[PDB]
Amino acid sequence: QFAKPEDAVKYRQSALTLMASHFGRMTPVVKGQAPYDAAQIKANVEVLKTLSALPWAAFGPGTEGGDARPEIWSDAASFKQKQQAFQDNIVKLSAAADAGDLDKLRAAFGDVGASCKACHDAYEKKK
Amino acid sequence: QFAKPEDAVKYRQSALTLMASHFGRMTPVVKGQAPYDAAQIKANVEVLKTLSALPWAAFGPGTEGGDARPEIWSDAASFKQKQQAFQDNIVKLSAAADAGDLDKLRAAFGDVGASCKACHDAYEKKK
């Protein structure tokens, strides 16, 4: 769907920005600093589910750019494992949210965050 | 979920960028320049549905910035009518996609596009 590599870069950066907001906005809830409303969180995690599937198709071959490391494309299988593992961590978060289980939500949230960082450490260029 | 107005601006711009991609990528399909696969379009319109609900919460009071006109906030009811009308146009597009009805999809696509433009004409600052 991208006319030039720049368009893929802009898409993925936008998708990832939206994920960071839908993930990060739950930090106060998991810390207990904001109240836990199970329905609110269930709905938010459903948005996060949708969003979490979107970036990867915008790293199609030849879409070097942005802060994407070239290793994304030189070992495609490894990158795919990391995004699939991240999405399965999102599945655990969805299960927790759908169950209304705050303890499970906290644990899953932490595992999701670790999975974001694991990918960044391998595949995101440093500042 | 936004620490500063800039964060709301960045969110909404990202959301709208993603909508433009999920909407616009169907242009060749509705024109017949690319093939029509009903399942593919159904899935894409479901993503567009989700995305189409997201920008509006990021125009909360005091989030002037970006290319948002101030009139968004001075007549809140009118802006709300436009976003709600746009989302109902998206409902028509979803119905068409879910039905696998290409004629209905073309018509709905055009009405959606008109609704994007109607809002921009009133509420988006010019270049």
Ligand code: HEC
């Ligand atoms: C887990 C919930 C997250 C969160 C919160 C974020 N990511 Fe990542 N990310 C990856 C790569 C390769 C990039 C660079 C993209 C490019 O510049 O081309 C990024 C970038 C981001 C951003 C910045 C977006 C921007 O505005 O430029 C943000 C906010 C972000 N990420 C948050 C790669 C990955 C992964 C590889 C499989 C995974 C998993 C994640 N990111 C997960 C997350």
Ligand code: HEC
């Ligand atoms: C219908 C499917 C669409 C499409 C394809 C787009 N929009 Fe809009 N839009 C609105 C406002 C107020 C702005 C400015 C936001 C800001 O700068 O603070 C925009 C902006 C955009 C963009 C640019 C995003 C960016 O990267 O900066 C794009 C690509 C975009 N839009 C596409 C307002 C509205 C509406 C008011 C109710 C409606 C409806 C739409 N937009 C619909 C659409």
